[PDB]
């Protein structure tokens, strides 16, 4: 069963890489949402207040 164990190991390694790419996506989604937040806080909120 050494061959099947090695296949399972390599499949999980690929799944782990899939999760790492999702982790990268989420990190950039944070950057994107923070950008929208900063713009609202700095440009739109004062505009409404004045």
């Amino acid at each position: 069963a050494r061959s099947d164990i090695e296949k399972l190991k390599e499949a999980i390694r690929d799944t782990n890489k899939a999760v790492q790419s999702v982790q990268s996506s989420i990190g950039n989604l944070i950057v994107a949402i923070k950008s929208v937040q900063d713009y609202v806080n700095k440009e739109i909120v004062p505009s409404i207040a004045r």
Partner: protein, 36 residues
């Protein structure tokens, strides 16, 4: 410091590119599982 519209577009395209890489890794994992 909000990103300018160009830089915002670069970030969105990076999110999409990494999502596409993620889908390829799942395809490869599923292919290996099929060979067991």
């Amino acid at each position: 410091v909000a990103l300018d519209p160009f830089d915002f577009s670069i970030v969105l395209n990076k999110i999409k590119s990494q999502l596409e890489e993620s889908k390829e890794w799942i395809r490869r994992s599923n292919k290996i599982l099929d060979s067991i």
